[PDB]
Amino acid sequence: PKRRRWLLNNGSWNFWFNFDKLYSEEIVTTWILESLIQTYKYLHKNTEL
Amino acid sequence: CSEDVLGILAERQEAMWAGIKALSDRKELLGSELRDIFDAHPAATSRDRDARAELAAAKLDMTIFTEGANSRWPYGIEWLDDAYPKPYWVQQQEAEAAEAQAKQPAA
Amino acid sequence: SALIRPGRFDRIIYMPLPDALGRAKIMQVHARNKAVDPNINWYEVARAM
Amino acid sequence: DEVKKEINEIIEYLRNPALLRSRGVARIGGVLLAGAPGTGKTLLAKAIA
Amino acid sequence: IRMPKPDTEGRLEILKLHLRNKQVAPDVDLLQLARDLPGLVGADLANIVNEAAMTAVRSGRQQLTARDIYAGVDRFTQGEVRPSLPTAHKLPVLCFAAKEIGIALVAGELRDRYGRVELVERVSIQPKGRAYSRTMFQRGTDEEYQLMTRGRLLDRIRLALAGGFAVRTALGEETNFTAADIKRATRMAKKYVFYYGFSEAGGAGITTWANQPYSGDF
Amino acid sequence: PAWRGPGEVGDEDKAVGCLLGAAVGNVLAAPYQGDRHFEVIRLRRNGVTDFWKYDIGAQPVQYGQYT
Amino acid sequence: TLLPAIEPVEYATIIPSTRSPLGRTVLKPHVGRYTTGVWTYRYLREQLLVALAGRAGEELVLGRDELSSLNQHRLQMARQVAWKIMNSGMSSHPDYQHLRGLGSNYFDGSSEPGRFQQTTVVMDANQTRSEAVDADMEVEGLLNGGYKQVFELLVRNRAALDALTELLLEREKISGEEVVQVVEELGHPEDLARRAQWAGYELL
Amino acid sequence: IARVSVCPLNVLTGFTLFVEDEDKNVNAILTRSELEGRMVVHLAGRCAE
Numbered sequence: 075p076k077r078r079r080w081l082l083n084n085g086s087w088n089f090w091f092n093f094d095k096l097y098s099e100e101i102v103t104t105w106i107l108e109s110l111i112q113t114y115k116y117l118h119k120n121t122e123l
Numbered sequence: 124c125s126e127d128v129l130g131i132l133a134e135r136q137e138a139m140w141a142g143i144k145a146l147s148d149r150k151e152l153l154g155s156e157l158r159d160i161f162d163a164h165p166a167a168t169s170r171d172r173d174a175r176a177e178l179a180a181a182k183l184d185m186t187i188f189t190e191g192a193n194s195r196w197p198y199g200i201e202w203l204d205d206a207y208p209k210p211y212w213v214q215q216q217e218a219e220a221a222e223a224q225a226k227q228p229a230a
Numbered sequence: 231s232a233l234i235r236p237g238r239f240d241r242i243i244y245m246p247l248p249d250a251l252g253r254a255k256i257m258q259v260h261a262r263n264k265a266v267d268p269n270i271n272w273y274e275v276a277r278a279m
Numbered sequence: 280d281e282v283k284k285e286i287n288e289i290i291e292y293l294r295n296p297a298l299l300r301s302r303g304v305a306r307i308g309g310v311l312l313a314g315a316p317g318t319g320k321t322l323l324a325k326a327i328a
Numbered sequence: 329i330r331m332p333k334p335d336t337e338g339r340l341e342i343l344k345l346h347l348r349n350k351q352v353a354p355d356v357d358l359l360q361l362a363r364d365l366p367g368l369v370g371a372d373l374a375n376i377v378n379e380a381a382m383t384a385v386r387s388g389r390q391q392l393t394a395r396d397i398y399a400g401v402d403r404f405t406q407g408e409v410r411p412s413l414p415t416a417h418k419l420p421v422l423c424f425a426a427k428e429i430g431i432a433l434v435a436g437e438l439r440d441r442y443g444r445v446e447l448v449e450r451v452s453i454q455p456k457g458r459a460y461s462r463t464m465f466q467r468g469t470d471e472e473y474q475l476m477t478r479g480r481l482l483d484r485i486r487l488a489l490a491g492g493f494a495v496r497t498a499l500g501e502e503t504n505f506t507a508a509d510i511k512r513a514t515r516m517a518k519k520y521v522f523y524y525g526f527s528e529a530g531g532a533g534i535t536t537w538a539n540q541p542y543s544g545d546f
Numbered sequence: 547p548a549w550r551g552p553g554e555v556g557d558e559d560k561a562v563g564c565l566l567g568a569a570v571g572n573v574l575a576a577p578y579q580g581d582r583h584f585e586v587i588r589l590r591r592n593g594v595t596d597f598w599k600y601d602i603g604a605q606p607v608q609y610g611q612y613t
Numbered sequence: 614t615l616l617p618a619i620e621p622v623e624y625a626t627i628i629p630s631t632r633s634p635l636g637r638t639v640l641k642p643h644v645g646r647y648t649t650g651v652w653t654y655r656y657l658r659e660q661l662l663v664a665l666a667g668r669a670g671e672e673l674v675l676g677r678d679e680l681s682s683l684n685q686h687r688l689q690m691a692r693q694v695a696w697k698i699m700n701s702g703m704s705s706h707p708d709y710q711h712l713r714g715l716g717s718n719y720f721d722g723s724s725e726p727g728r729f730q731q732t733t734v735v736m737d738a739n740q741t742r743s744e745a746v747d748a749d750m751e752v753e754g755l756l757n758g759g760y761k762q763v764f765e766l767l768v769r770n771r772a773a774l775d776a777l778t779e780l781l782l783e784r785e786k787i788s789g790e791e792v793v794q795v796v797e798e799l800g801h802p803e804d805l806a807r808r809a810q811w812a813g814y815e816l817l
Numbered sequence: 818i819a820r821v822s823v824c825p826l827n828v829l830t831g832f833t834l835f836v837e838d839e840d841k842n843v844n845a846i847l848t849r850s851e852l853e854g855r856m857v858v859h860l861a862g863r864c865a866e
């Protein structure tokens with residue numbers, strides 16, 4: 075029972091399908107950072123409270 | 124096989140239509156009646172332009188990958204050399220083919 | 231396969247599913263008891279069933 | 280329609296047995312009603328009675 | 329005592345004694361009949377002949393003809409009759425008739441080029457049992473069916489494809505009829521390449537792998 | 547230019563030709579009653595340019611019979 | 614009979630029994646190999662040829678369009694031989710020749726005291742993704758080169774083949790002495806020369 | 818089309834009730850024109866939104 079869907083190991087490591095993991099990951103990371111930055115920017119002007 | 128069948132059928136169109144017209148009415152047919160109905164309309168003796176166009180439409184475009192020049196290592200796969208190291212027997216075949224077609228210019 | 235021998239059970243009758251007109255007739259009698267707006271195009275409401 | 284033109288003869292038997300019990304046709308001993316969940320075959324039976 | 333299932337001749341003789349009282353048209357070949365019913369046991373032929381008899385008495389005749397015997401056989405192998413195909417539109421009857429006629433036509437054509445296929449017997453588009461249309465062939469002797477040569481399998485494949493390709497060449501448009509052909513065909517085609525080894529895969533037809541069936545006991 | 551044939555035709559040819567054209571058009575288009583153009587041009591891929599002999603409609607037409 | 618590493622025939626029939634629906638050819642059981650287990654490599658190659666000979670001869674006589682379904686199990690047996698050569702470290706691949714089988718061997722008890730059944734597991738941890746292609750390509754080379762070889766063998770000896778089939782058709786069962794006699798009086802000279810060279814040796 | 822509705826039973830979708838003809842493709846036929854038409858109709862909503 076070996077793996078038979080080799081597709082690329084020349085400049086990366088890919089298997090058949092996967093196309094959809096780079097888009098997903100960049101979206102997730104970008105949105106989480108934007109949210110954290112908005113939280114920081116609000117709390118940064120209300121330190122006395 | 125599918126090209127063979129489509130070639131058989133796009134000659135006896137009249138026989139098929141006579142058979143359909145006959146069968147749709149009685150809803151049943153016996154082998155003898157069918158055989159004589161199909162014998163009544165033989166195929167055309169010559170090929171007219173309409174018959175030639177129909178026979179050219181009786182072709183398929185089913186792609187066959189390892190056909191002709193694609194019978195050797197890449198087998199017509201564009202990405203095979205970015206995924207697999209070249210096997211050993213493939214290198215041997217390349218070597219013997221190269222020596223064959225490279226001593227024949229001297230032979 | 232014992233009862234299907236002659237004399238015991240030698241006749242089978244197939245009762246099929248209704249059609250447009252059959253369904254229209256069926257629902258025209260389920261209205262003889264209940265209250266129903268009379269001018270109902272029974273044929274069309276039966277075509278969609 | 281088909282089984283109408285058929286069950287005319289079983290009704291013929293149910294009306295008068297010695298009319299066709301000797302007239303060549305066999306003894307009508309048993310019949311099966313086949314249809315589908317929801318065919319309500321009882322209905323048909325009543326009509327024959 | 330061990331009584332086995334009857335062979336061709338056993339069924340033939342049961343038929344002979346079962347119609348000994350009756351009268352049959354001289355055209356039907358009951359050797360050919362008993363040759364096309366492998367798997368029945370004794371009483372089924374009685375049911376068939378009685379059913380044919382009652383269709384005879386409903387036909388206002390007494391002589392049993394090919395049509396009545398075929399009706400009996402069909403009722404006791406396929407099932408009860410069912411209402412006919414609609415006629416308000418061209419499509420249904422046209423498509424099913426095209427299926428039947430294409431199969432019959434290419435069968436009769438292949439039979440007249442190599443001689444391996446059988447002969448067609450009876451075409452019908454009377455919805456009867458579970459199917460809407462039917463095409464029966466004349467079975468040969470058991471000696472015919474012990475082997476499977478290459479040409480015979482090629483012809484079986486072509487016959488599998490004929491129905492859908494006929495509907496498409498008559499109607500002018502693809503349907504889902506092809507769906508039921510290719511499936512069957514593909515199965516056979518695999519058996520043609522891997523298990524039996526008839527193709528040219530490798531220079532000879534011997535591949536490194538093949539899938540042998542398992543018994544139906546499992 | 548356009549159709550030429552004869553010069554300016556007489557008065558009897560006009561009438562007999564009108565009735566003849568009506569008859570041939572009717573008997574030609576008879577079997578294609580009640581379907582769309584794509585179905586037709588896929589049933590007659592070679593063109594509707596002669597009479598049909600196998601019509602199987604609910605009220606079937608025979609060869610060369612008009613409506 | 615013409616391969617110097619295979620045992621001599623003992624009898625050949627064409628009368629099917631109640632369990633084998635075709636003929637049989639039976640060889641003299643060599644006790645040495647059967648008792649020690651010394652099945653050499655030469656012998657395995659020749660056994661491959663023998664396993665394909667049936668289909669080779671069918672195609673030679675009855676034409677290619679008449680290949681039958683009588684050689685399904687002989688094809689399975691030829692596959693068995695060809696994979697055993699690869700999995701027993703007899704290959705000609707340099708990374709495989711005298712070094713490895715195919716995978717990991719695990720034995721299991723059969724339905725007897727001394728019977729063991731072998732199993733081989735092959736994963737990504739022992740086959741490197743481009744040795745799979747070589748295993749396939751070499752087993753395929755073995756099978757199809759063997760077929761071509763035996764086909765040419767039977768081509769060179771057509772006379773003996775037809776004589777043998779006529780005699781078999783007329784007697785329904787023959788013994789080894791008749792076979793060897795016929796083939797020695799009708800065989801090709803070079804094949805008989807080879808068969809005579811290796812005539813005395815016990816084990817090969 | 819027999820009826821077009823918006824959020825029936827409060828579900829957050831639409832709903833269109835299609836009535837068809839059973840005497841044209843008798844529960845078994847599927848041409849190519851029909852399939853392409855269905856694809857277009859099912860993508861229409863996304864495109865309009």
Ligand SMILES: Nc1ncnc2c1ncn2[C@@H]1O[C@H](COP(=O)(O)OP(=O)(O)NP(=O)(O)O)[C@@H](O)[C@H]1O
Pocket residue numbers: 256315316317318319320321322
């Ligand atoms: N021709 C008809 N006219 C009026 N009502 C009908 C007709 N046919 C069926 N029905 C209705 O069908 C309903 C279901 O009948 P039912 O007795 O359940 O038949 P059934 O097929 O035996 N049920 P099942 O045992 O599950 O198959 C009845 O209550 C009837 O009102």
